[PDB]
Design an enzyme around this catalytic site. Structure first.
Site, mmCIF file in Angstrom:
data_model
loop_
_atom_site.group_PDB
_atom_site.id
_atom_site.type_symbol
_atom_site.label_atom_id
_atom_site.label_comp_id
_atom_site.label_asym_id
_atom_site.label_seq_id
_atom_site.Cartn_x
_atom_site.Cartn_y
_atom_site.Cartn_z
ATOM 1 N N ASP A 177 -0.638 3.356 -10.792
ATOM 2 C CA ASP A 177 -0.671 2.240 -9.862
ATOM 3 C C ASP A 177 -1.895 2.354 -8.973
ATOM 4 O OD1 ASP A 177 -0.199 0.355 -7.798
ATOM 5 O OD2 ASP A 177 1.849 1.076 -7.362
ATOM 6 N N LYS B 143 2.171 -0.673 6.698
ATOM 7 C CA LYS B 143 2.879 0.226 5.759
ATOM 8 C C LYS B 143 2.501 1.700 5.926
ATOM 9 C CE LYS B 143 4.204 0.359 0.867
ATOM 10 N NZ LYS B 143 3.996 -0.356 -0.419
ATOM 11 N N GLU C 148 8.896 1.667 -5.975
ATOM 12 C CA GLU C 148 7.912 0.803 -6.646
ATOM 13 C C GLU C 148 7.719 1.183 -8.120
ATOM 14 O OE1 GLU C 148 4.606 1.160 -3.905
ATOM 15 O OE2 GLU C 148 5.767 0.072 -2.378
#
Ligand SMILES: Sc1nnc(-c2ccccc2)o1
Length: 379
Positions: free
Chosen positions: A196, A68, A172
């Protein structure tokens, strides 16, 4: 259908289905509700997920993670050149694009980041198919809010290679807000802060939601801060303790430090729901056992800077959004590290005692929201 949501995470991925009006997060074949975003190449086979993570210490140069961090970028990008210095696997350049280089079946092979990510997506697809029966055709897949079009497209390409119809690529934090129904709650514009904190990344996002329309107002955080940093602090403390009691320095010994980290990871999880955890290591070093305990208070002490430091990206996201903290209507917790009570306390005190959205398992909220969105899109 089925309506499928996939959180394609930096180190762990999660898959959910929306069925009979609600989301079911799907456990994999080892019963785990999240799956390592790990692909390992061996002398005979490709391992994905838990099987890949489980042999990582045995095969570090041929076990891929953090694809990623490469997907959609150029080899020459500063983040690529920096990140490469910290990976045990080799990264090379093909037509200016990064590729991981591994040994597989005794030969050298190269894979684009979207090829590694497609293998992870195939595992998530198969996990959903064992749970559901039959075949999964379509999915919503999530990406960080700061992903550019090249990163979004290369993530979609991983879906295409896997043979998924990608219904939408969504942010997200947007998926986390959708999980909590924040687009249907209350009606006016809502400022939502998503906090997050994962195993290796920390993302703060400020969104506005109005009449079902999401806009990203600001993003901030630290791309190399997560739950593994808290584990590092406990490992140092407890290696020191073992040195004090048993006069043995485990520091130069890779296997001893690794086993200590494994115990520490597990202890940290217990400390989010109990005030102490027991470490039980058989023959840690020269036949000497390490059986001990750590309290939550000690764990918070070892991490005081890291935990308190999470509020600085919160302040910067507010500054960039030109918002006062009193203007945030909703706070959403995402990532396994937000289960840590001290982080919750620091965040809640910063927001003058405001209650946190935390009833959804924070490591599952993104896949949960992606699954609701997929249901909407297939209608
Ligand atoms: S499907 C879908 N939703 N967003 C995208 C997208 C966005 C930017 C670049 C490429 C694909 O694809």
């Amino acid at each position: 259908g089925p309506a499928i949501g996939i959180d394609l995470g930096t180190t762990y991925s999660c898959v959910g289905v929306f069925q009979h009006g609600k989301v079911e997060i799907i456990a994999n074949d080892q019963g785990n509700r999240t799956t390592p975003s790990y692909v390992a190449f061996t002398d005979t086979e490709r391992l994905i997920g838990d099987a890949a993570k489980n042999q990582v210490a045995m095969n570090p140069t041929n076990t891929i993670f953090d694809a990623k961090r490469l997907i959609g970028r150029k080899f020459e990008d500063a983040t690529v050149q920096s990140d490469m210095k910290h990976w045990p696997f080799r990264v090379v350049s093909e037509g200016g694009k990064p590729k991981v280089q591994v040994e597989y079946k005794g030969e050298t092979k190269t894979f684009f980041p979207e090829e590694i990510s497609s293998m992870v997506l195939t595992k998530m697809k198969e996990i959903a198919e064992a749970y559901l029966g039959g075949k999964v055709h379509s999915a919503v897949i999530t990406v960080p809010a700061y992903f550019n079009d090249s990163q979004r497209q290369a993530t979609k390409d991983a879906g295409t290679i896997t043979g998924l119809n990608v219904l939408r690529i969504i942010n997200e934090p947007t998926a986390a807000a959708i999980a909590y129904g924040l687009d249907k709650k209350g009606g006016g514009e809502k400022n939502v802060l998503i906090f997050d904190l994962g195993g290796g990344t920390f993302d703060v996002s400020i969104l506005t939601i109005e009449d079902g329309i999401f806009e990203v107002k600001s993003t901030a955080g630290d791309t190399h801060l997560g739950g593994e940093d808290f584990d590092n602090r406990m490992v140092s403390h407890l290696a020191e303790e073992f040195k004090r009691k048993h006069k043995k320095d485990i520091g130069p010994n890779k296997r001893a430090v690794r086993r200590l980290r494994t115990a520490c990871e597990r202890a940290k999880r217990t400390l989010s729901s109990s005030t102490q955890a027991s470490i039980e290591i058989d023959s840690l070093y020269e036949g000497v056992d390490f059986y001990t305990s750590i309290t939550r208070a000690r764990f918070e002490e070892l991490n005081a800077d890291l935990f308190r430091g999470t509020l600085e990206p919160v302040e910067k996201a507010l500054r960039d959004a030109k918002l006062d903290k009193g203007q945030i209507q909703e706070i959403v917790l995402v990532g396994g590290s937000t289960r840590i009570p001290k982080i919750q306390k620091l965040l809640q005190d910063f927001f003058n005692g405001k209650e946190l959205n935390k009833s959804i398992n924070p490591d599952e909220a993104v896949a949960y929201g992606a699954a609701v969105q997929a249901a909407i899109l297939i209608g």
